[PDB]
Amino acid sequence: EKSQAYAEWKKALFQPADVILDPNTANPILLVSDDQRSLQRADERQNLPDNPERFDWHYCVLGCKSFTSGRHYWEVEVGDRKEWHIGVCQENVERKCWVKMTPENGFWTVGLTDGSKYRALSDPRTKLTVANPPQRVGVFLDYETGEVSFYNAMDGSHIYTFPHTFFSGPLWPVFRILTLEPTALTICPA
Amino acid sequence: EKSQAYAEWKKALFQPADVILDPNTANPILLVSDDQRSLQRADERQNLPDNPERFDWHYCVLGCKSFTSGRHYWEVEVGDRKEWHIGVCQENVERKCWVKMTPENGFWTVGLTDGSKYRALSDPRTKLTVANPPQRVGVFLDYETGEVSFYNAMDGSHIYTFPHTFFSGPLWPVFRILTLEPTALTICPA
Numbered sequence: 001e002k003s004q005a006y007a008e009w010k011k012a013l014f015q016p017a018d019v020i021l022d023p024n025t026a027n028p029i030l031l032v033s034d035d036q037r038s039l040q041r042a043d044e045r046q047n048l049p050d051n052p053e054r055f056d057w058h059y060c061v062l063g064c065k066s067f068t069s070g071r072h073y074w075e076v077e078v079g080d081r082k083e084w085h086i087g088v089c090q091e092n093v094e095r096k097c098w099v100k101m102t103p104e105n106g107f108w109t110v111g112l113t114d115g116s117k118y119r120a121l122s123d124p125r126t127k128l129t130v131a132n133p134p135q136r137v138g139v140f141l142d143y144e145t146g147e148v149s150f151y152n153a154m155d156g157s158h159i160y161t162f163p164h165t166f167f168s169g170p171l172w173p174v175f176r177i178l179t180l181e182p183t184a185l186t187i188c189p190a
Numbered sequence: 191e192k193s194q195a196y197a198e199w200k201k202a203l204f205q206p207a208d209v210i211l212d213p214n215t216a217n218p219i220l221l222v223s224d225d226q227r228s229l230q231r232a233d234e235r236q237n238l239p240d241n242p243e244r245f246d247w248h249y250c251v252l253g254c255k256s257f258t259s260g261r262h263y264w265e266v267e268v269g270d271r272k273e274w275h276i277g278v279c280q281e282n283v284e285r286k287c288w289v290k291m292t293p294e295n296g297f298w299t300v301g302l303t304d305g306s307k308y309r310a311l312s313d314p315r316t317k318l319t320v321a322n323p324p325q326r327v328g329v330f331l332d333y334e335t336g337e338v339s340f341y342n343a344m345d346g347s348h349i350y351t352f353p354h355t356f357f358s359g360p361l362w363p364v365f366r367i368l369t370l371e372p373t374a375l376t377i378c379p380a
């Protein structure tokens with residue numbers, strides 16, 4: 001059973017992350033749920049303080065915990081949301097000015113545009129071919145081997161693995177949404 | 191550098207397998223080189239014994255040693271070949287009658303058809319998008335987690351990961367070539 005083997009694999013090798021959204025980091029156009037599990041976009045930017053930790057250009061928010069070591073996974077209910085990008089980024093990313101979200105710029109993210117265009121946000125972007133659109137996505141980090149990978153968390157099918165790299169400093173769970181859609185992104189608890 | 195990270199990741203996690211081909215398993219249309227590292231195809235079936243372990247239908251050959259446990263990798267020079275498939279199969283796969291080469295039938299393989307069509311031999315087959323056609327492919331096995339994955343061995347880019355599974359019995363390196371063409375399939379030594 002592919003669900004069973006996915007469950008047994010993630011349990012054997014990856015620490016289960018309990019990820020909550022940090023509204024202090026969130027671009028002003030983002031709405032973070034009271035339980036800090038769910039992410040929607042506002043109509044327009046809210047008036048929030050431009051504290052140094054807040055994303056002011058990218059429509060990004062971070063988790064409340066970073067990783068400097070170990071294997072970690074978390075799963076995100078993306079449901080039928082037609083646009084979303086998730087993964088990890090370095091503590092030291094540019095949060096204020098425009099930069100391309102690329103591994104070179106400290107972002108390892110994949111996701112969906114316009115309902116049907118899956119991409120890895122590599123440089124240049126990798127067009128994914130996804131036979132079964134995921135409803136829940138597992139994010140898998142191995143700090144020591146520089147590994148960031150993504151799976152369909154319902155059927156265990158692989159989506160994308162970045163080239164193995166070298167990480168500098170802490171890695172944060174990162175979430176980006178560009179559009180207004182009925183379906184929020186929701187983090188599954190550990 | 192992605193090559194260096196690829197080298198450090200296989201060193202951290204995977205035991206380098208020294209794979210040689212077992213000519214007694216090779217379909218009678220295949221030629222195994224005397225050093226048992228290279229594979230070619232004949233114009234017709236040659237006259238060989240139909241010993242039980244020989245693939246009579248599928249243009250396959252196994253390695254000389256199996257895996258019942260652990261993390262293992264080997265790399266295969268596919269060069270400019272227009273057709274090839276490689277991966278692992280269970281000891282108990284059908285050798286004589288036709289079976290579809292699928293995980294359900296005990297086969298975990300990916301490869302190339304008609305020079306440009308990269309596929310995983312899932313059921314259904316998964317169409318791959320590969321930006322840089324590999325000359326050398328890394329095959330990565332984790333027996334315990336039921337993981338088979340494939341990399342471009344030269345630049346470290348990921349090709350394909352099968353859904354995690356549960357293996358039954360020993361796994362063998364398997365190699366398949368269907369075409370009569372100038373470039374051999376060559377295994378890289380450990």
Ligand SMILES: C/C(=C\COP(=O)(O)OP(=O)(O)O)CO
Nearest residue numbers: 057058059060100101125176178
């Ligand atoms: C406006 C915006 C993001 C769009 O960035 P880009 O337009 O660079 O596109 P992508 O390839 O999706 O990163 C806010 O995060």
Ligand SMILES: C/C(=C\COP(=O)(O)OP(=O)(O)O)CO
Nearest residue numbers: 247248249250290291311366368
């Ligand atoms: C004739 C032959 C193999 C072709 O099998 P199939 O025609 O099932 O094709 P594939 O999807 O490539 O496995 C001998 O191994």
